[PDB]
Write an enzyme that holds these catalytic residues in place. Structure first.
Site, mmCIF file in Angstrom:
data_model
loop_
_atom_site.group_PDB
_atom_site.id
_atom_site.type_symbol
_atom_site.label_atom_id
_atom_site.label_comp_id
_atom_site.label_asym_id
_atom_site.label_seq_id
_atom_site.Cartn_x
_atom_site.Cartn_y
_atom_site.Cartn_z
ATOM 1 N N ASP A 35 -21.668 1.519 -4.533
ATOM 2 C CA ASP A 35 -20.818 1.676 -3.371
ATOM 3 C C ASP A 35 -19.358 1.422 -3.715
ATOM 4 O O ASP A 35 -18.917 0.272 -3.747
ATOM 5 C CB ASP A 35 -21.288 0.693 -2.296
ATOM 6 C CG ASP A 35 -20.496 0.806 -1.015
ATOM 7 O OD1 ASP A 35 -19.697 1.753 -0.892
ATOM 8 O OD2 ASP A 35 -20.688 -0.037 -0.112
ATOM 9 N N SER A 199 -4.926 12.891 -0.318
ATOM 10 C CA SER A 199 -5.163 14.304 -0.566
ATOM 11 C C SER A 199 -3.952 15.114 -0.126
ATOM 12 O O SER A 199 -3.261 14.746 0.821
ATOM 13 C CB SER A 199 -6.421 14.755 0.184
ATOM 14 O OG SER A 199 -6.601 16.160 0.121
HETATM 15 C C1 LIG Z 1 -27.371 1.316 5.623
HETATM 16 N N1 LIG Z 1 -26.840 1.538 4.288
HETATM 17 C C2 LIG Z 1 -27.791 1.843 3.230
HETATM 18 C C3 LIG Z 1 -25.481 1.518 4.042
HETATM 19 C C4 LIG Z 1 -24.976 1.744 2.762
HETATM 20 C C5 LIG Z 1 -23.615 1.768 2.526
HETATM 21 C C6 LIG Z 1 -22.704 1.583 3.562
HETATM 22 C C7 LIG Z 1 -21.227 1.717 3.372
HETATM 23 O O1 LIG Z 1 -20.470 1.891 4.319
HETATM 24 N N2 LIG Z 1 -20.764 1.674 2.112
HETATM 25 N N3 LIG Z 1 -19.388 1.818 1.834
HETATM 26 C C8 LIG Z 1 -23.207 1.340 4.839
HETATM 27 C C9 LIG Z 1 -24.569 1.299 5.076
#
Ligand SMILES: CN(C)c1ccc(C(=O)NN)cc1
EC number: 3.4.23.22
Length: 330
Positions: A35, A199
């Protein structure tokens, strides 16, 4: 050093991507959602409230000879979609694709929100934004990338997400065979802790390019592409029958449509998102209304270049002293 790991869509819509990560000794392999929009490495664990675990693989620190409680440390995070999780913290050895960090903060969930419980395929998150966003208290912790950086051959990682297919996260090197043409680099602001960039504009289908600055974040942990309402309206106006539905929560379109491509600017370069990438399928099983992959960022507060955009490119997250982002076609 370098690392290289394959990342795999969790479902037929590319709702998210999971990457295997080795934690502890002997290794416990968990499938984590890498992430670039957050900075906590957290996992389902033996400490997670039992009723909130549904099929996930858990980290059990008591079975790791290298795990150590980070005494007094807690964490608590909430994401833009309203999801959340919280718990306490261990340090342990973490490896991704052959790249090992010792003493990595591994945040053990005591509580997770329903969205996480329901995602049986996601065993936790591995944050790759800037460490200034890390939520551990009272001593903020570093991301896996931040910890690895000095050892890496080059202080970079790359995201090469697939459309309905596996892709790759590389650490410490740029695979020059993984993209076409040249990589265009663009400035990053770290002021909010994100990979935030601007961008240079957009085009819809074969239409003329509109030069306009669009600030946003490169977020591998967000599924869709969230852009200003003006831009999004211009896109969906080119799809017969498309409309914004307050009941569904965004733009929908007839599943009989053929979607146009969407182009975004990176400096003088252009990344083209094929129309197919913008199809997220029936809103409910059997419906002839389909959910769009480009949605308004109004009421988020920030534009988000999520997976819909990033998977159209080979993306370099350059963590040199002055960070930059690079995009190439592929
Ligand atoms: C519910 N899940 C798997 C998520 C996974 C990632 C995120 C997110 O905003 N990442 N920047 C939110 C929720």
């Amino acid at each position: 050093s370098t690392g290289s790991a394959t990342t795999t869509p969790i479902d037929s819509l590319d709702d998210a991507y999971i990457t295997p990560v080795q934690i502890g000794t002997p290794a416990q392999t968990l499938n984590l959602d890498f992430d670039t929009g957050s900075s906590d490495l957290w996992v389902f664990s033996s400490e997670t409230t039992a009723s909130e675990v549904d099929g996930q693989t858990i980290y059990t620190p008591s079975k790791s000879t290298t795990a150590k409680l980070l005494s007094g440390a807690t964490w608590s995070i909430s994401y833009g979609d309203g999801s959340s999780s919280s718990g306490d913290v261990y340090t342990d050895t973490v490896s991704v694709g052959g790249l090992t960090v010792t003493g990595q903060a591994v945040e053990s969930a005591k509580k997770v929100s329903s969205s996480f419980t329901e995602d049986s395929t996601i065993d936790g998150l591995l944050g790759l934004a800037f460490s200034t966003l890390n939520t551990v208290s009272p001593t903020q912790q570093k991301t896996f990338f931040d910890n690895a950086k000095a050892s890496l051959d080059s202080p970079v990682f790359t995201a090469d997400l697939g459309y309905h297919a596996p892709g790759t996260y590389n650490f410490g090197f740029i695979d020059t065979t993984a993209y076409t043409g040249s990589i265009t680099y663009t400035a990053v602001s770290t002021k909010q802790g994100f990979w935030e960039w601007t961008s240079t504009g957009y085009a819809v289908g074969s239409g003329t390019f509109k030069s306009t600055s669009i600030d946003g974040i490169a977020d591998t942990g967000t599924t869709l592409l969230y852009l200003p309402a003006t831009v999004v309206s211009a896109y969906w106006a080119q799809v017969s029958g498309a409309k914004s539905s307050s009941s569904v929560g965004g733009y929908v379109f007839p599943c009989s449509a053929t979607l146009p491509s969407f182009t975004f600017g990176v400096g003088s370069a252009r990344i083209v998102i094929p129309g197919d990438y913008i199809d997220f399928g029936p809103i409910s099983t059997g419906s002839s209304s389909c959910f769009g992959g480009i949605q308004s960022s109004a009421g988020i507060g920030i534009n988000i270049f999520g997976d819909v955009a990033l998977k159209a490119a080979f993306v370099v997250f350059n963590g040199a002293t002055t960070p930059t982002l690079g995009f190439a076609s592929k």
